[PDB]
Amino acid sequence: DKPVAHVVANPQAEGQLQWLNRRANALLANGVELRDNQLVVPSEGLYLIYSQVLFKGQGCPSTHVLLTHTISRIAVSYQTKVNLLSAIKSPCQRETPAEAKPWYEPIYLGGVFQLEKGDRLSAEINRPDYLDFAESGQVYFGIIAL
Amino acid sequence: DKPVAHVVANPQAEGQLQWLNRRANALLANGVELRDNQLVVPSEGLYLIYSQVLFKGQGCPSTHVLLTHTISRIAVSYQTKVNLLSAIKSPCQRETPAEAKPWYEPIYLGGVFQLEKGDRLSAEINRPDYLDFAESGQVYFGIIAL
Amino acid sequence: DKPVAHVVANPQAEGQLQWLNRRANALLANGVELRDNQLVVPSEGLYLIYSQVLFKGQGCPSTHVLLTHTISRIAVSYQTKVNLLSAIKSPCQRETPAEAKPWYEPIYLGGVFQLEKGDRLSAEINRPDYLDFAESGQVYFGIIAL
Amino acid sequence: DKPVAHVVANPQAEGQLQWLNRRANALLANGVELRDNQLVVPSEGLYLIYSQVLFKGQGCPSTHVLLTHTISRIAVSYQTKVNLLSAIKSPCQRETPAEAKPWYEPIYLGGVFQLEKGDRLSAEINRPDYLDFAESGQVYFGIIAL
Amino acid sequence: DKPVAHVVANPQAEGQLQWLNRRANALLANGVELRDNQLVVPSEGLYLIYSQVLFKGQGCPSTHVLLTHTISRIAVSYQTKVNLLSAIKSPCQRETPAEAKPWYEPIYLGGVFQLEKGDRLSAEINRPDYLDFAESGQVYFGIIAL
Amino acid sequence: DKPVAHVVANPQAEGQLQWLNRRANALLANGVELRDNQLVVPSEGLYLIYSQVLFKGQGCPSTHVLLTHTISRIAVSYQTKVNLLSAIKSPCQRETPAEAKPWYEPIYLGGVFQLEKGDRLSAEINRPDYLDFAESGQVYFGIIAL
Amino acid sequence: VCPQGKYIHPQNNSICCTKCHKGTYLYNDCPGPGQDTDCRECESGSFTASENHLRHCLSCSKCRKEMGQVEISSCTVDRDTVCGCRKNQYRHYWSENLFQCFNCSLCLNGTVHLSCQEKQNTVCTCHAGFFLRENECVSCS
Amino acid sequence: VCPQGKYIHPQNNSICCTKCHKGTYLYNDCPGPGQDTDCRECESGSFTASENHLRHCLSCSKCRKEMGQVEISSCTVDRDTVCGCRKNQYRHYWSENLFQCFNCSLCLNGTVHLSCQEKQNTVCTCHAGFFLRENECVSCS
Amino acid sequence: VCPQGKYIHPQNNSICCTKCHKGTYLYNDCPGPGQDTDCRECESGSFTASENHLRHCLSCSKCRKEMGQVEISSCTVDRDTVCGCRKNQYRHYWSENLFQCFNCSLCLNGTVHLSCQEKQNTVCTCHAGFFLRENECVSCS
Amino acid sequence: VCPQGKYIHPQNNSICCTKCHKGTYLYNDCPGPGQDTDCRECESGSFTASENHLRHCLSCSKCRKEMGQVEISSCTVDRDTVCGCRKNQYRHYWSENLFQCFNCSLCLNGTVHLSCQEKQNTVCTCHAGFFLRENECVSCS
Amino acid sequence: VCPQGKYIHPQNNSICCTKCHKGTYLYNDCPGPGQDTDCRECESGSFTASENHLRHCLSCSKCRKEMGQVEISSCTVDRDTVCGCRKNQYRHYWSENLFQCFNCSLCLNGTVHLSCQEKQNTVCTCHAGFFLRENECVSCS
Amino acid sequence: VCPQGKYIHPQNNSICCTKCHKGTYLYNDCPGPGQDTDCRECESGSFTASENHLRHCLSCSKCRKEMGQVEISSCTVDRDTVCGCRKNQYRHYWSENLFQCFNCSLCLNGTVHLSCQEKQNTVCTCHAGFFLRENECVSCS
């Protein structure tokens, strides 16, 4: 009866981050809804919110690249976007001269928050084109009531 | 009634890591206390301990820089500091020649531990001057009883 | 009565990743078993699965090095290895010319999954020789029933 | 069964010389009693009597200072104070002009005497305010039957 | 059959204090051992512990000089160093202006202590370079069971 | 029946050091003889040899003054003078400019030695004119068989 | 369904009360129907930028020194900290809330088609013998 | 202990039913003993490669473009996506499920002891005056 | 409040018993008031460095090979593993428990003001025509 | 050879019993095998800093007033008295257990290469026309 | 418990005999109950100042020449040597039995409140324009 | 009473044996009447300067550097170390075995009555207008 959600990124839509439920090892149970690529909790309580985003890249671009992963909350109590969790990474330090060696960078967010009914949680990134869709379990989002 | 704590770093004290409670999306409920920049649990049980530290830097220094994040426990059963969780990062591999491109490095720790009453948990870092105070949800600590 | 497991890597077996239970701040309680370096759950339910692997290196090798951490599941419902969680890192971008500056890379995995009775969970890596056995709390695995 | 006494000066009473027994490396065994800051032998025989007094001083006072250490005996055969052992020291020769350099002076007395039952032995000094109470083993008194 | 030890300083090793046994008027009899420049008693009983250290100096140095002689005990009952006897001297009060007149300072320690089997007694000094090796009987250590 | 000797300096012979027996708190018992101002032991065994010499002085002389106290042994096994114990002191560091402030210096020797029958022990000094004859117990010599 | 500007009481869900305005946070609930809500002003370093009934104020942001950002506006009780760039600089947005200040690209062997905006670099159009590359005019040969 | 090919019902643990075959996932449990199980075909982008009673199909993998991989076989309902390398290329396995495509090393001043296999580089044996280094024949001097 | 050296029993909180010493861990609680506690010696690779009633011994650390550390003392049952540096090397602490061994800086065109300590590099004072930089004497011109 | 944490009984040398912890001294031996040892708390002015079976507690030290020492920590039952120096002072060790507090040397016509540590004076590097002597910069002429 | 003036015989502790008076020392014990004790007069340089049964007489003291002491009374058989100071001098006691003779402080620009006693210096009270310091009247300016 | 050069055996006091000569110490007693004694040569740093039956050799002395002494002869097995003074220096004996080297007093405005001996300073006789003081001729006025 515990509201639980564990959604995985869609491997068929390159260039955007879309969450799915009707896949193996993915859950949407006990009231949690998936609307507008966002998770809506069914009750007020303490939720563990977690997410993991894997960025891939063929070589290092000439310009510097920053990868930002942010779990944000739009609640009925504030009605604005509030960043619950945030992380920034800089995968490349110098331009590739030669063979473009691939780079991989994982970013994990995890916390416990008190959420009211109707709050919408969104896991957003700044560079959707760098997303990893090769194998399952690399990019995912989730909230579990506690 | 579950002892829960989710504290965020203070954005007004540059050069030190101080935890706060009286801020939005931060909790100190059901017996957990904040004393001497440390978290004190009110009962013996299983706690999920999590933390995330974001290090920022303008360019790469000439000397090598190591960033260490450690969640340590001082219990009534051992009365010494014991590292529950630890992680080390090396953000810079070579000295910046040119424009100093910024670098960002997130470090996340998370585990489940059996803790007795009166145990003190401290999230410590080696380079407080590199801490990220720009936005909320970047550096935080937390323990939730389970 | 909650099935809980928090195992730490063995610091005496260089070249392989072995999990231990009879150590401080390590738990194997309420039915979870450690067989063939794998964790076996005692009941069907929702489990938070977490792991953290720290890779160390003296200098950058001439060939490119990839570090892969994968939490995989062999259940009684599929009877094949299924990657629940996965992450890839590329610690070195260029060969070290000079003094071999050490590098450290942490990889953290965490999620919530519905697991049946008898499922076997294995945390595997691709480069066991790079593992960190210096201090406790750096490399660990864990599952907690929820 | 040999009457033995090895007493140390009290480090908590500044301005007076008091002997203690219930401390480590201090003895009062086989009949020797500590009454009125004096040692009373339980039998007639040959006793080795020893004492050591350390005087400390911050700088040299304008007036000349003399330090006298005397082990005296009040026996049942004479009923008056008789100086068994005596020593005099002059720590300072000239007044300090500048920084007051500290001075230390040890005085040791040791002899063998024939003592009757009921004799009282007292180790007395002239300047109790100069006594050394910093560490154990610096000021002490003792008698051992032989 | 009485455990006795009377050791003399080595006159051939300038800069360190080493005890010898195979010399005239020096004894190591009835179980007392000389290990690691320390004396080990063979039985539990009352021991008279004595030592004498002579410090020599050509003139008075500009900086103040303190000479510390300490007889310390490491027993099987406490397993830490405990100062049985201690003395401090200040040979020089002012800097030599002119001819450097030599100075000599003797420090004598003597007491009676109850010692258990396996206790290690060490006579230590702070300025080994000032030691007197000119003639025998000037610097010596000794313990005699009683 | 233990050979014991505790002799005191003669207060009536200025300029020389003479030992006496027929005085209070002075002993010559069980075979020890006083011949030629020297002590002769009656048997071979272990003897505790002790002595204390107090030097007095009215002011500091222009020339430097050294006070040497030596307990020496002339045995039947070597037939030459051998210094069992020795100590040197330098009471004055500078010439007195003004009032001649008195100075006092005690020198104590103590040890345990194996002595054969017929051995002669002599306590000698270099400056007899500086001797202290004011009160008893200031200058004395002694040997006790053990 | 109470009208706009009012929130339902967490306990006894039949009475609704007005939300606290900007710069204030909820300290106590409504002591009965029709009474005013306990709204307390945010302390230093905390703010609320919209109508809310939150138990605590949001932590105001800080300008990133490594990004070249400068503090245009201070951290008030009702407005978040405003971070921007100095003169002749434009902000490049890595993400929604993250931006870096870069100096405006001066035209070399070219003309300014569009001036340096707040969130856009200078648009430079080259002439014959030069072509654009990374917003810089370079010779073809 | 029911025979092979059958799983125990999660509720009323006295009746077991046959597992769904490849390409199908469980939608509903057995409506009584002896009846067939509700097995539904996997949708697009989902697959099941073995007999199972899982509530949903596994997400089929995608070939990594940065590793030079190519799609030998498409994502079907019962077989996972097959990724490999093109002509004259071999795969080097960084891990169990991760591999990178590299061009086969052509022999220079040497002979081919073994041809370029699927998961092995070309084995080249050098001659006098040359020696092997990183699977390349280079001069000793 | 029981006197020092004793811990309260987890069950029946009216009887306290003595803690286990170094090198021992708690296996069972006190079988009544006045009896001894079940303290068992730590196994290989485990230690306890202080008085404790912990259910298991701490895992002794390992010396870092990439930092140049060497094993001064082995992992005993009561003392943690001691890691240090070899001759003519000093440890530089990145954190409280992390250090790297560096070779002591030999003075070039300078004098040793202070010798190489355990946790401090060699202090070098240069002469005329040279100045200090990164603990090395270099010419001004 | 009994396991760690236990000492052999002085009489009837076949039964060993646990040592007394810090802050306690032995008052009586073990009243049989398996019973607890009589460990009594140290009185005022006495302490035991390690596990022991000593018959009496060690006398805690006193801070030297002539050396400028100050009492950082009081004489407890298990920890020795801690003596140190006040602000802007460093301790110079004459011996292992003897030290004197000296004021930190302020740089005059020089720069601070290393700050005043706990057991080290301020390291001062002079400029042209000055040289170091007794940790003070003085003119060459 | 024999009455006053009598001591118990060291052997055969049932007969007590009278102690020797001043100026005499015990040479032999009592040759039976009721007989007189063998008391012999002290030789030169020896004395006994009270009733005693000591085996030898105490050595009489000598006046210290460096302290300015003079021999008021000689060393007799029953009285100790008396040492003092000459005219217009007072003794200052460093200890119980040690004293030094100092000349009495003459009043300068002051009056004698108390004359020079045996063990006390002259008390001098100054007038207007002078104040006391080390028992000497000195000008304020 | 055995003749000269022989000592009585410590056990069985009816047989005497010859004493060891210089440079040798007794290691074992006589294995019967008429046999030679076990005399072993002294090791480095030890000596015996006379006929003896001592169990160990005397420790040879060392020349005092603070007294200006120099090593005329080394520490042999049968002769003690000889310490003296260099050219134009004489030894002043503070005690029987302690001496200090002082430079010989050169005559100023005087003549040498006796030259500088080994243990005596130069004797200088002054002339008219000068007189002796501390072995130096100084003017009367």
Curated annotation (Swiss-Prot), chains A, B, C, D, E, F:
The cysteines covalently paired via disulfide bonds are 60-92
Q: Where is the THD domain?
A: 3-146
Protein's cellular compartments:
Secreted
Question: Hey, which stretches end up on the Extracellular side?
Answer: 1-146
Reported effect, residue 27 to F: Biologically inactive
Q: Which residues form the signal peptide?
A: none
Q: Which domain of life is it from?
A: Eukaryota
**What's the protein name?**
Tumor necrosis factor, soluble form
Question: In which organism is this protein found?
Answer: Homo sapiens
UniProtKB/Swiss-Prot annotation, chains G, H, I, J, K, L:
Start and stop residues of the TNFR-Cys repeats: 1-40, 41-83, 84-124
Glycan attachment residues as annotated in the record: 12, 103, 109
Stretches in topological domain Extracellular:
1-141
Q: Mutating residue 33 to L leads to what result?
A: In FPF; benign
According to the UniProt record, which cysteines are disulfide-bonded? Answer: 2-16, 17-30, 20-39, 42-57, 60-75, 63-83, 85-101, 104-116, 107-124, 126-137
Q: Which residues does UniProt call coiled coil?
A: none
What's the protein name? Tumor necrosis factor-binding protein 1
Organism, as annotated: Homo sapiens (Human)
Provide the organism lineage as a comma list: Eukaryota, Metazoa, Chordata, Craniata, Vertebrata
Gene name of this polypeptide: TNFRSF1A
Whole-protein residues included: 43 to 183 of 455
